[PDB]
């Protein structure tokens, strides 16, 4: 889970 997901 990258900061932004789904909009990473």
PDB file as gemmi writes it, atoms N, CA and C in Angstrom:
CRYST1    1.000    1.000    1.000  90.00  90.00  90.00 P 1                      
ATOM      1  N   UNK A   1       0.806  -1.206   0.000  1.00  0.00           N  
ATOM      2  CA  UNK A   1       0.000   0.000   0.000  1.00  0.00           C  
ATOM      3  C   UNK A   1       0.842   1.261   0.000  1.00  0.00           C  
ATOM      4  N   UNK A   2       1.182   1.743  -1.190  1.00  0.00           N  
ATOM      5  CA  UNK A   2       1.991   2.949  -1.325  1.00  0.00           C  
ATOM      6  C   UNK A   2       1.139   4.201  -1.140  1.00  0.00           C  
ATOM      7  N   UNK A   3       1.681   5.179  -0.422  1.00  0.00           N  
ATOM      8  CA  UNK A   3       0.972   6.428  -0.172  1.00  0.00           C  
ATOM      9  C   UNK A   3       0.459   7.038  -1.473  1.00  0.00           C  
ATOM     10  N   UNK A   4      -0.835   6.893  -1.716  1.00  0.00           N  
ATOM     11  CA  UNK A   4      -1.434   7.433  -2.925  1.00  0.00           C  
ATOM     12  C   UNK A   4      -2.438   6.425  -3.486  1.00  0.00           C  
ATOM     13  N   UNK A   5      -2.133   5.149  -3.271  1.00  0.00           N  
ATOM     14  CA  UNK A   5      -2.989   4.069  -3.745  1.00  0.00           C  
ATOM     15  C   UNK A   5      -4.460   4.388  -3.495  1.00  0.00           C  
ATOM     16  N   UNK A   6      -5.308   4.085  -4.489  1.00  0.00           N  
ATOM     17  CA  UNK A   6      -4.865   3.481  -5.750  1.00  0.00           C  
ATOM     18  C   UNK A   6      -4.057   4.451  -6.605  1.00  0.00           C  
ATOM     19  N   UNK A   7      -4.296   5.744  -6.411  1.00  0.00           N  
ATOM     20  CA  UNK A   7      -3.589   6.773  -7.164  1.00  0.00           C  
ATOM     21  C   UNK A   7      -2.201   7.017  -6.581  1.00  0.00           C  
ATOM     22  N   UNK A   8      -1.285   6.090  -6.836  1.00  0.00           N  
ATOM     23  CA  UNK A   8       0.080   6.204  -6.336  1.00  0.00           C  
ATOM     24  C   UNK A   8       0.901   7.148  -7.209  1.00  0.00           C  
TER      25      UNK A   8                                                      
END                                                                             
